[PDB]
Amino acid sequence: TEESKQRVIQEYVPGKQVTLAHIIANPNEDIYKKLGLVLDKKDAIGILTITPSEASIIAADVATKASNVSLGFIDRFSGSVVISGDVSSVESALNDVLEVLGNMLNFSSTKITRT
Amino acid sequence: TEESKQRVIQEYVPGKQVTLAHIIANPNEDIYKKLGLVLDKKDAIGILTITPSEASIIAADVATKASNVSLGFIDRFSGSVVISGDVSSVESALNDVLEVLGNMLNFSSTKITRTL
Amino acid sequence: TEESKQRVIQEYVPGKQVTLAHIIANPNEDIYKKLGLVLDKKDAIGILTITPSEASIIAADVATKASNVSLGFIDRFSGSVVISGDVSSVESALNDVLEVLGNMLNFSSTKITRT
Amino acid sequence: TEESKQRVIQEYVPGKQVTLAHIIANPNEDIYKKLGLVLDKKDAIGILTITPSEASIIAADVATKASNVSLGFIDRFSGSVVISGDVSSVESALNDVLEVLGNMLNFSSTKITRTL
Amino acid sequence: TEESKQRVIQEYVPGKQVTLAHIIANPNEDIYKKLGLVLDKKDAIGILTITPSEASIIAADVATKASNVSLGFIDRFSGSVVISGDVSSVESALNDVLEVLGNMLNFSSTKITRT
Amino acid sequence: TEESKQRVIQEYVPGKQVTLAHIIANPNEDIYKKLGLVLDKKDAIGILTITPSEASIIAADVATKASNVSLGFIDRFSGSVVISGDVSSVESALNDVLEVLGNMLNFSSTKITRTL
C-alpha cells in the first residue's frame, strides 16, 4: 500500500566507476556494422562503460595514446567508448584506461573481461 | 511534510544485470513490424534487457554467433537486444548470453522465460 | 548542509513491474488524437505502464493474441502500451497481460482500474 | 573516499503520484506562447505533474470531460498535462483528476495550489 | 561482489525543490550566445533549477510578473528557467519565485547566490 | 525473489556537486575533433562534470573570464563544460570554478586531476 512505504529524498549525482572493460576478439560483422564501425576481419573491439559520462573523453584519449587502437566511437552523453585494433593493442589500451581512471582518479574499477 | 523527509545523496552507477531473457514463439505481425523486424512466420523472437547498456554489444555478438539466429536489433543506448530464428536456436542463443554475462562476467541474471 | 548528508552508491537496474493497467471506456477525442490513435466512437482504450521497457513487447503480443484489440502503440523505450477495442476485449487483453507478466514472469503487478 | 561508501542495488520502478496540481489565473503571454498555447486573456491554466507518465492520459481525459476546459497539451513521456479555461472550471477539472488518480487509483496526491 | 549487495525496489517520483537561484551580473558573451540569449552588455541573468520540471512554468510566470525581466528560456523538460534584466530586477524576480515555490508551495528552497 | 525486496519511494532532486575537473595536456586530435573542438596543438583541455546541469552556465562563465581560456562547449542539459587553452590557464580556470561552486555555493567538490 501507498501508505506503508517509506519516502526519502534522494539527491542524485553521478558516481565515479568503470563498470565494464571488455574485449571481443572476433566480433560478428552484423554487430559492428550496426555500431557504425569499419574494421578488418582481424580486428578486436574493446568496450568501456564509464560514469560520469564526461570521463569517456579521458578514457578515449588515454586509450589512443596507449597503443595502436582506433577510436570506434565516443559517446559523451552515456559514457561509452568503443575502440578497435589487434587484441594485444586493445588489451594495453584498456589496461591504461583502468590504471588512469581506477588508480589515478580513484574511480571504482573492474578487471578486463573477454568473450 | 517536506520537513519530515530524510535526505540522502545517491551516487548513481549502472548495475550489472540481465533482467529479462524472453522467448515469444509466434509473434504477432503487427508487433514485430512495429519493431522493424522482417521474419518468417515460423520464427520466434528473443528479447533481452541488459544493464549496463554497452553490454548489449557483448550479448548481441554472443547470440548471433549461435547457429540459425539473426540479429533483430541492438540498442546500445537502452541495452535492448532482440534476436530471431527457430525457437530452439533462439533459446540456445539466449542461454549462451546468460552464460557469458551471468557466469563469466558475474552479472545478476535471470532464467529464460517464454510466452506459453 | 552538504556536510550532514549520508552518501551511498546506488547501482541502478530496472525493476519488474506492471504499474498501471487501466481502461478508459469512452475516451475524449482530443486526447486520443493527440496520442495518434484512430478509433471508433465506441472504442475503449487500455493503458499499460511496464518496467523493464522491453517487456512492452511481451505485453503487446499477449494482448493482441488474447482478444480482438488493436495495438494503438508500443513504446519500447518507455514501456508504454496502449490498445483499443470494445471494453470487454480490452479487459480480457489486460487480464491476460497481467497473468503472463505478473503470475508467470513474477513481475510486481496491479489490478485492472477503470475511469 | 571511494572505499568508505555503502553500495546498494536499486531496482527502479515508477511511483504513483500527482506531485503538482497548480492554477495560474492570468498567465503571462510570453510564457504561454512558449508552451504552444492559444488562450483568451481571461483564461487560466492548470498544470499537472504525474508519475507514471502514462497516467497523463487518464488525467487529460478526466480533465477535458470537464465543462468549459480545453486541453493545452499532454506529454505522455514526461507525464505533464496543461489545461486551460476559466479559473473555476480549471480548478474543477484539477479536482476531478485528483479524485480519480488519488482516491480511486490510490496515487499519492497533493492539494490544488494557485499563484496568488 | 554481486552476492554481497542489498537490493531494494525504489519507486521514483519527482521531489519539490528549487536547487539553484543564481545571478550572473555580467555574463560572458560567448556563454549567453551559446544559450540562445540576446542581451544588452548591461544585462544580468538569473538561473533557476526546479523539480518537478513543470514548476518551471510557475516560476517563469512569477518572475515575469514580479519585475522587468525578460524570459530567456523555459525548459519544461528539465525545469530550467533563465531570465535577464538589470541586477535589481533579476534579484526581485528570483526572490518572488522563491517566496511562491518555497513558502507558498512548500518546495525545498535555497538562498539567492551571485557570481 | 520479488516477494523479499524492500520497497521505498524515492523523491529525486539534483545534488550539488562538481564530480570531475580534469586537465588533458595534449589531447589526441581524433578525440578533440569528435568533440567539435578546434585547438592549437599546444592547447590543453579542461573537462567539468557538474550537477545540477544549469550550474554549467555558472562554471562556463567563471572559466571563460579566465585569461587565455576559450569555451569548448557547454551542455546545459548534461552539465558538461569543456574549455581550452595553455595548460596553466586551463588549471587556473578550473580552480576558479571549484572556488565559486565549491566554496561559495557549497557544492561538493573534487580536486583537479590531470592525465600525466
Give C34 to chain B, closest Cα distance, Å. Answer: 19
Joined together, the cell numbers standing for residue D110 give 497533493
Decide if D15 and E16 are in contact by the 8 Å CB cutoff.
no
Instruction: Tell me: cis bond preceding C52? Omega within 30 of 0 counts.
Output: yes
For residue F69 the three cell numbers come to 581560456
Domain of residue E22 covers 1-115
| Chain E residues touching C11 at Cβ < 8 A | 5
Chains that touch A (3 or more CB pairs under 8 A): B, C, D, E, F
DSSP string over E69-84: -EEEEE-TTT--EEEE
Judge whether C9 and D5 are in contact, CB under 8 Å. yes
- Around Cβ B5, how many Cβ atoms within 10 Å? 14
Contact present, E105 and E99 (Cβ < 8 Å): no
Inter-chain residue contact A10 with F9, CB threshold 8 Å = no
Give φ, ψ of E17 to 5 degrees. Answer: -155, 135
Q: Are B14 and B53 in contact (CB under 8 A)?
A: yes
Cα–chain center distance at C20: 6
CA-to-CA distance for A6 and F23, rounded, in angstroms?
A: 42
- Asked if C1's CB is within 8 angstroms of F108's CB, the reply is no
Comparing CA positions, the residue from C114, C32, C108 lying closest to residue C70 is C32
Residue burial A40-78, b: 16+ Cβ < 10 Å; e: rest: eeebbbbbbbbbbbbbbbbbbbbbbbbbebbbbbbbbeb
Task: Give the residue among C35, C39, C77, C34 at the shortest CA–CA distance from C56.
Answer: C77
Answer whether E5 sits within 8 Å of C15, measured CB to CB.
Answer: no
> What is the chain D residue with the closest CA to B15?
D9
Instruction: Tell me A108's DSSP state.
Output: B
Please indicate if any CB of chain F lies within 8 Å of the CB of D78: no
CA atoms of F31 and F82, how far apart (whole Å): 13
Coil vs helix vs strand at D86: coil
Q: Which residue's C-alpha cell is 559517446?
A: A75
Nearest CB to D2: which of A1, A2, A16?
Answer: A16
CA distance, residue C21 to nearest chain A CA (Å)? 17
Strand order in the sheet with C70-74: C70-74, C81-85, C44-51, C17-24, C113-114
CB contact (8 A) between residue F28 and residue A54:
no
State whether residue F106 sits within 8 Å of chain C by CB. yes
Nearest CA in chain F to A17: F19
- Which residue in this structure is represented by grid cell 589515478? A104
CA distance D99 to chain A (A): 16
Contact A58 F24 (CB under 8 A): yes
CA nearest to F70 within chain E = E30
Residues in chain A: 115
Query: How far off is chain A from E43, nearest CA to CA, in Å?
Result: 32
Residues of F in contact with B10 (CB under 8 A): 10
Q: At what angle do helices E87-98 and E55-66 cross, to 10 degrees?
A: 130
For every residue of D50-69, DSSP letters joined together read: EESTTHHHHHHHHHHTSTTE
The arrangement of strands across the sheet holding E113-114 comes to E70-74, E81-85, E44-51, E17-24, E113-114
Q: Do C34 and D65 touch (CB under 8 A)?
A: no
Q: What is the CATH number of the domain that holds B116?
A: 3.30.70.1710
- Residue B41: how many CB atoms within 10 A of its CB? 8
Of E73, D108, D42, the closest CA to residue D21 belongs to D108
Interchain pair A15, C9: CB under 8 A: yes
Q: Which residue among E15, E34, E78 places its CB closest to the CB of F53?
A: E78
H or E element, residue C29: helix C29-34
Choose among D11, D15, D17: nearest Cβ to F5: D11
User: Cell match 578514457: residue?
Assistant: A59
Q: How many domains does chain F have?
A: 1
Please name the member of A11, A17, A108 whose beta carbon is closest to the beta carbon of C5.
A11
**Chain A partners of D19 at a C-beta cutoff of 8 Å?**
none
**Residue F97 CB-half CA count within 13 A:** 36
Q: What contacts E103, CB < 8 A, 6 or more positions away?
A: E109
Whether the bond between B52 and the residue before it is cis, its omega within 30 degrees of 0, is: yes
| DSSP 8-state assignment for residue D2 | G
Cis peptide before F52 (omega within 30 of 0): yes
Which residue among E1, E2, E106 places its CB closest to the CB of B2? Answer: E106
- Name which of B1, B2, B108 is nearest E2 (Cβ-Cβ): B108
Q: In what order do the strands lie in the sheet with A113-114?
A: A70-74, A81-85, A44-51, A17-24, A113-114
Q: Which residue of A has its CA nearest to D102?
A: A2
Q: Cβ–Cβ of E19/F5 closer than 8 Å?
A: no
**Shortest Cα distance, chain D CAs vs residue E58, angstroms:** 7
Side-chain half-sphere of E25: how many Cα atoms within 13 Å?
A: 5
Question: What are the CB-based long-range contacts (under 8 Å, 24+) for D84-87?
Answer: D84/D37, D84/D39, D84/D43, D84/D44, D84/D45, D84/D46, D85/D43, D85/D44, D86/D42, D86/D43, D86/D44, D87/D23, D87/D25, D87/D44
Residue C80 CA to residue E30 CA, distance in Å, equals: 41
Q: Are B71 and B64 in contact (CB under 8 A)?
A: yes
CB contact under 8 A, C108 and E5: no
Query: Do residue D8 and residue C7 have CB atoms under 8 angstroms apart?
Result: no
- Render C58-98 in DSSP notation, one character per residue: HHHHHHHHHSS-EEEEE-TTT--EEEEE-HHHHHHHHHHHH
Chain D contacts in chain B segment 5-44 (CB below 8 A): 10-11, 15, 17
